[PDB]
Design a protein around this ligand. Structure first.
Ligand SMILES: [Cl-]
Ligand SMILES: [Cl-]
Ligand SMILES: [Cl-]
Length: 195
């Protein structure tokens, strides 16, 4: 496989970027030069979010006032406006406002045995962008991922129906998958393997 070996410094820097997340907000969806975007104001901060992939046809044009956003600034720039990719999901329904789901979370480092950790899911519609960032954040902070040459491995998200979502730790998550979302009520097990 002829894939660019991402520097662990690059992966550390990207996955340490501050996150802007808000639930039940308004975004205005539009198409600009054949590409789909959603604009959101959070605390007088402007974000333009690319809807590339599946999320492209999930939102209606114009006002979407039932959304949750997980915003990460792409690039290193002086521009005030945030440019983020995916992480736009449907907000929880009223019966599910206080919703908590605790899937199994295990983190395995090298040849060591997996270590269980408490992980809480609050969303019915959760993006791979959010799960990817938050699981890599835990692996970085507690198990030294992207330090001392620890740059390889996998994230495995297993659903109640047996379907699995795998994320390669040696690369950033695929831009197309940042807009993909799964049923948070259906996440059973999570494994973060580092090598
Ligand atoms: Cl997937
Ligand atoms: Cl990509
Ligand atoms: Cl992509």
């Amino acid at each position: 496989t002829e894939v660019k070996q991402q520097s662990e410094s690059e992966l550390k820097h990207y996955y340490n970027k501050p996150v802007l997340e808000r639930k039940n907000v308004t975004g205005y969806k539009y198409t600009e030069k054949g590409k789909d975007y959603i604009d959101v104001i959070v605390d007088n901060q402007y974000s333009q979010i690319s809807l590339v992939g599946s999320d492209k046809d999930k939102f209606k044009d114009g006002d979407n006032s039932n959304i949750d956003v997980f915003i990460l600034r792409e690039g290193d720039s002086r521009q005030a406006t945030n440019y983020s990719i995916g992480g736009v999901t449907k907000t929880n329904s009223q019966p599910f406002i206080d919703y908590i789901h605790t899937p199994i979370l295990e983190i395995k480092k090298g040849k060591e045995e997996p270590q269980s950790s408490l992980y809480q899911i609050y969303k019915e519609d959760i993006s791979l962008k959010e799960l990817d960032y938050r699981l890599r954040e835990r692996a970085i902070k507690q198990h030294g991922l992207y330090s001392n040459g620890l740059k390889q491995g996998q994230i495995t998200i297993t659903m109640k129906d047996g379907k699995s979502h795998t994320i390669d730790l040696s690369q950033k998550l695929e831009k197309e998958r940042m807009g993909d979302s799964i049923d948070g009520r259906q996440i059973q097990k999570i494994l973060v393997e580092m090598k």
